[PDB]
Structure formats: structure tokens, C-alpha cells
Write a protein that binds this DNA or RNA. Structure first.
Ligand SMILES: Cc1cn([C@H]2C[C@H](O)[C@@H](COP(=O)(O)NP(=O)(O)OP(=O)(O)O)O2)c(=O)[nH]c1=O
Ligand SMILES: [Mg+2]
Ligand SMILES: [Mg+2]
Ligand code: NA
Ligand code: NA
Length: 321
DNA sequence: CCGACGTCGCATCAGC
DNA sequence: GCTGATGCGA
DNA sequence: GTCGG
């Protein structure tokens, strides 16, 4: 409904992040963009938008200019700037951030071709990102995601039937499509007060050719790439997968957070504060009278957390906000 | 006016 | 060689 | 860039 405006702002967001290296202005512009994307009227003036939490004066002027002229001078100029449009563009390769993109572009390396003639100046992560540049900007239909889930749960269980594994993120909320697969993994032998538990699982998903590459991997977090096996039909795009190993006592705080949504997590956490509780990704802790969080409270399911702060347990179907 | 604005695991660099 | 800092993604 | 202490 204000796509013209929310695109304008989303473009501005990226340049701040990618060219100006001003992460907070990026987030500001995104916040503005979100709040407007939900406003159910066609905006008529910058003054009208300025009412929304997150649209201040400078953005209200931009909207004014945009509504009157159909463009923004600053955006027009920057879009056409050889250096800046190039720095902004190379950041689309996973693993190249604004700092690596600046350096390339400084040494003349501007395009995906340029990257392709310079593999040796790229780290491992960045090469996988180049390799799969296209696939990484595709969404994943739920149908494939269910096929992916099948594989992960089968293979996890087959390594050791006592592992618990939950596919979280936009998939667990019932979205028709996902941008990646986030897997949360625990095992009764692993608690906070507690050692190749993640490795054996990556091992097995590699063994059956589900996991095809590795961005990064430690004792707790796996970041890599995976692909469904090819059915006649054309093969499946490579997909981003993360696998996290969480201690059992923090596992459900984990599930809940990595289930989201963003906005839902904000509310729930705010609410929980006003009920005298502190929730992070790991633990819910009781705020005392001066405001000192004491020991973490025992959690054994999701619903537990909801009880604690007296909220009606939420089916993830309804965790939009 | 002027500081907060998410926090953290992992890879890899800069410094010693 | 080790330790902390920075970049990156999410 | 926006907000708020
Ligand atoms: C990025 C982000 C994620 N989260 C939580 C909620 C997300 O649903 C969950 C996974 O994040 P995601 O993979 O970036 N977004 P998504 O999985 O809900 O949907 P998709 O990956 O865009 O398809 O992590 C936050 O609580 N704050 C954040 O800033
Ligand atoms: Mg800057
Ligand atoms: Mg996701
Ligand atoms: Na305002
Ligand atoms: Na990038």
C-alpha cells in the first residue's frame, strides 16, 4: 500500500548498512519501513507518517519529496554511483559484509564476475556464498521444508534415539515458505551444569549427502548448506541450514526464541518484565525487588514459560505478534 | 543534549 | 604460539 | 535516524 515508500526506505536501509557502515541508521530505516508496511491507509503526507513510532522528521521530509516527485534525489544519485552501488551489491554474497565489500571495490573488484576471477582473495565462507549466490536468495516452499524435516529427524534419531530435535523458525509457525532451516538440538546427557554431540549429527547428514558444505562449525553451532536429493525432474536449490546444540535446561527457552516471530518475542519479553520476570534465549529468571535477577527457573516444556508469566499458552500458528 | 539502538558463536585477523 | 579484536550472520 | 531520559 505504500510499497513505493517502504522500498524507498528499504533501499536507504541497505546503503546505511552496506556503504555508510551505520548499523543503527539501517535499523532505523527498517523500523520505519515495518511500521509503515502495517499502516492500513495510503499515506498522503510526511506529517501523517510522522505519527508512527519510528518515523521522525528526516523520514517525513523524504516521504514529502517522494510523494511530490515520485523519487528521492539522494537515492537517485547513490543508485547511479559506481562505487556505492557496487559496495552495496557485493554484500549480497553471504560472508562478504560491508567491510569486505569496501576492500574489494577499492581494489577494483566490483562484480560477481570479478569475484569469480579472484577466488584466492575469498575466504571459505565467501566462496560458498559465491558458489550459491542465486540459491541463497530463493525462498523455500513448505513442501520442501517438510521433506527436509523428514530427513533431519530421521538422521538425528538414527545417530542416537535420545536426541531431541525441533525445526523452529518460520517453519514451526506454519509459514507457506521459509528463508532457511533452523534446527535446535539437545540430548539428555547435555545440561548447563554439565561432547561430540553436534559433530556426530553433522557427520551423519553429511554421510547421506544432505549437508553439502560448511560455513562454520564448533561444539554448539553449525552453519552450513544442504540440498534435497534429486527426484527426471530438475535438482533442488542449495539451502541454508543451521543446527544448534542447546543444554536441556535451556532447550525450551531456545525453542521458543528461535520460533519467534521477531515482534512476538518483543511483546512476550516486555510482558514478562512487567510480571517481574526476565527472559532471554537461555533462561527465564525472577526479577527481585531492587531489580536483581536470581537463579534461572526450571523449564520442561514451552508452556512452562507461559505459566510462569501467566500467559495463555500459544500455538506457534498464532505467534505472529 | 546526547547515548542506546540484541547479543553471541565462530572464523580469521592484528598484536604481541 | 597465544589472546583479544573485528567482521559476519542471524 | 528516532526516541527518550
Ligand atoms: C533475526 C531475528 C530472529 N529472531 C528469532 C525469531 C525468528 O523467527 C527466529 C529465526 O530467525 P530467522 O531465521 O532470521 N527468521 P524466520 O526463521 O522466522 O523466517 P525466515 O528465516 O525469514 O524464513 O529467530 C529474533 O528474535 N530477532 C531477530 O532479529
Ligand atoms: Mg559510518
Ligand atoms: Mg529461519
Ligand atoms: Na515521531
Ligand atoms: Na554478505
Amino acid at each position: 500500500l505504500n510499497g513505493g515508500i517502504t522500498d524507498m526506505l528499504t533501499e536507504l536501509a541497505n546503503f546505511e548498512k552496506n556503504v555508510s557502515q551505520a548499523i543503527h541508521k539501517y535499523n532505523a530505516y527498517r523500523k520505519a519501513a515495518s511500521v509503515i508496511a502495517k499502516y492500513p491507509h495510503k499515506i498522503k503526507s510526511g506529517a501523517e507518517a510522522k505519527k508512527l513510532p519510528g518515523v521522525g522528521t528526516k523520514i517525513a521530509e523524504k516521504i514529502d519529496e517522494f510523494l511530490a516527485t515520485g523519487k528521492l534525489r539522494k537515492l537517485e544519485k547513490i543508485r547511479q554511483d559506481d562505487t556505492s552501488s557496487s559496495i552495496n551489491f557485493l554484500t549480497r554474497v553471504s560472508g562478504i559484509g560491508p567491510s569486505a565489500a569496501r576492500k574489494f571495490v577499492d581494489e577494483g573488484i566490483k562484480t560477481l564476475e570479478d569475484l569469480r576471477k579472484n577466488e584466492d582473495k575469498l575466504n571459505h565462507h565467501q566462496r560458498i556464498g559465491l558458489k550459491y549466490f542465486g540459491d541463497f536468495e530463493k525462498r523455500i516452499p513448505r513442501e520442501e521444508m517438510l521433506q527436509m524435516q523428514d530427513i533431519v529427524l530421521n538422521e538425528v534419531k538414527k545417530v542416537d534415539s535420545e536426541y531431541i530435535a525441533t525445526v523452529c523458525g518460520s517453519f514451526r509457525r506454519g509459514a507457506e515458505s521459509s528463508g532457511d532451516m533452523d534446527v535446535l538440538l539437545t540430548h539428555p546427557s547435555f545440561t548447563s551444569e554439565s561432547p561430540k554431540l553436534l559433530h556426530q549429527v553433522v557427520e551423519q547428514l553429511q554421510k547421506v549427502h544432505f549437508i553439502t558444505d560448511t560455513l562454520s562449525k564448533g561444539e554448539t553451532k553449525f552453519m552450513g548448506v544442504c540440498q534435497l536429493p534429486s527426484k527426471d525432474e530438475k535438482e533442488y536449490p542449495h539451502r541454508r541450514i543451521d543446527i544448534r546444540l542447546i543444554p536441556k535446561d535451556q532447550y525450551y527457552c531456545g525453542v521458543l526464541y528461535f520460533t519467534g516471530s521477531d515482534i512476538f518475542n518483543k511483546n512476550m519479553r516486555a510482558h514478562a518484565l512487567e510480571k517481574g520476570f526476565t527472559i532471554n534465549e537461555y533462561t527465564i529468571r525472577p526479577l527481585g525487588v531492587t531489580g536483581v535477577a536470581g537463579e534461572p527457573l526450571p523449564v520442561d516444556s514451552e508452556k512452562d514459560i507461559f505459566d510462569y508469566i501467566q500467559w495463555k499458552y500459544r500455538e506457534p500458528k498464532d505467534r505472529s505478534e
